Amino acid sequence: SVTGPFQCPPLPYVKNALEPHMSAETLTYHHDKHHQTYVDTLNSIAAENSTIASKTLEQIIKTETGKPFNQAAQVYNHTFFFNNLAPNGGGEPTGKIAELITRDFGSFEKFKEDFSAAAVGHFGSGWVWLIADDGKLKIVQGHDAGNPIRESKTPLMNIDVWEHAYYIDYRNARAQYVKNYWNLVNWDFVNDNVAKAGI
Amino acid sequence: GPFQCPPLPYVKNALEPHMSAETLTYHHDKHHQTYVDTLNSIAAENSTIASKTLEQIIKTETGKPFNQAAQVYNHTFFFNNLAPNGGGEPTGKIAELITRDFGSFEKFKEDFSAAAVGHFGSGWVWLIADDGKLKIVQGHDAGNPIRESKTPLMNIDVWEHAYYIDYRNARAQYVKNYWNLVNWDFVNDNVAKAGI
Numbered sequence: 001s002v003t004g005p006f007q008c009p010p011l012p013y014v015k016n017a018l019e020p021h022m023s024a025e026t027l028t029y030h031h032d033k034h035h036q037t038y039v040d041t042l043n044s045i046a047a048e049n050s051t052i053a054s055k056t057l058e059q060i061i062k063t064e065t066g067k068p069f070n071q072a073a074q075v076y077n078h079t080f081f082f083n084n085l086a087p088n089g090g091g092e093p094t095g096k097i098a099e100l101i102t103r104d105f106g107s108f109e110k111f112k113e114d115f116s117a118a119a120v121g122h123f124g125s126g127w128v129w130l131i132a133d134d135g136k137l138k139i140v141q142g143h144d145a146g147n148p149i150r151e152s153k154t155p156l157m158n159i160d161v162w163e164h165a166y167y168i169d170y171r172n173a174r175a176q177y178v179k180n181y182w183n184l185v186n187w188d189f190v191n192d193n194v195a196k197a198g199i
Numbered sequence: 200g201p202f203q204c205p206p207l208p209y210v211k212n213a214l215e216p217h218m219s220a221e222t223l224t225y226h227h228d229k230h231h232q233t234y235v236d237t238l239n240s241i242a243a244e245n246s247t248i249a250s251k252t253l254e255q256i257i258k259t260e261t262g263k264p265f266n267q268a269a270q271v272y273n274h275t276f277f278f279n280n281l282a283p284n285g286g287g288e289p290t291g292k293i294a295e296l297i298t299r300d301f302g303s304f305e306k307f308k309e310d311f312s313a314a315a316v317g318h319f320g321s322g323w324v325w326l327i328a329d330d331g332k333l334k335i336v337q338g339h340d341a342g343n344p345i346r347e348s349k350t351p352l353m354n355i356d357v358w359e360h361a362y363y364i365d366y367r368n369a370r371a372q373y374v375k376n377y378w379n380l381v382n383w384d385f386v387n388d389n390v391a392k393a394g395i
């Protein structure tokens with residue numbers, strides 16, 4: 001009844017809050033089944049590995065291998081993903097990311113083209129990330145649980161392209177899912193990530 | 200052309216309740232067909248790829264062309280690996296080889312299931328003949344043991360699209376129902392052709 005030590009943070013919005021772009025049924029399975037289960041399994045390992053209980057998700061991402069890495073990475077990836085969406089989100093970015101997007105991709109339209117193409121093209125399960133590398137914006141793909149924190153890097157935005165993220169709502173139409181993700185982006189969260197990094 | 204998506208070996212609801220008509224429609228009419236289409240589009244621009252068999256591309260190709268050719272084969276194999284009136288205990292040569300190489304069908308079932316439930320991300324679990332020996336091997340993403348000149352006998356798709364409509368996140372329920380569908384005739388045919 002006291003389970004831990006890792007926890008699955010609650011969604012920052014109610015289940016129907018992202019409709020029609022992402023369904024309540026999707027949020028329920030994706031968060032309450034997939035996300036929560038990754039945390040449960042990690043905890044199972046933590047119970048028998050005091051080294052893995054002593055480490056932050058980020059330290060496990062940087063330092064672990066195999067299943068423990070995959071689990072910690074996935075727990076972080078989903079928390080970041082769900083934080084990265086919002087009921088009053090979407091549309092063109094404002095504030096500092098808007099400036100940096102212009103700086104590094106020329107325009108939001110071009111950034112949107114690049115990021116969508118990466119997300120639509122990723123073969124198999126994975127993630128697409130907007131990262132700040134050494135103060136510079138870059139789009140990187142993470143196959144399976146791949147997370148750029150393992151390298152030097154700072155995540156700013158992501159999209160989950162594992163099939164479970166969209167199959168209930170879009171079946172195999174990943175491109176339609178990616179299109180709809182732009183209506184959901186939480187630019188306030190993205191801008192907080194910018195602010196926290198030096199950039 | 201040059202590549203084609205073979206029709207399903209049975210009508211869309213033939214596998215219910217284990218696998219739904221809706222799953223067969225999406226998996227075959229959408230995923231499988233689209234792999235073929237995309238490979239065909241690459242073939243129109245790539246005379247080398249257009250010159251090759253699917254198995255030649257699986258053995259020697261790279262990048263996107265490999266992934267597509269392998270997925271075309273993998274899905275044809277998989278849909279052939281299922282049958283209405285399949286399932287149950289194997290008979291014939293495969294039954295003998297499984298007892299030989301795993302001790303019992305039950306032990307093989309355990310091993311194969313654990314591999315399929317265990318596979319992280321998108322992939323395939325194969326039963327293979329390797330110099331006449333049965334082995335279980337995992338193919339991540341489009342991985343196919345023909346690339347290592349091994350002979351495929353059985354497979355299961357553990358890409359989420361294979362089960363999500365019918366089982367959502369419950370992959371282990373999908374894997375258990377798969378045993379009710381296995382087309383042992385197809386598996387024995389593969390055994391016969393391999394000469395093992």
Ligand SMILES: [Fe+3]
Binds near residue numbers: 162
């Ligand atoms: Fe996910």
Ligand SMILES: [Fe+3]
Binds near residue numbers: 226230274356358361
């Ligand atoms: Fe498939």
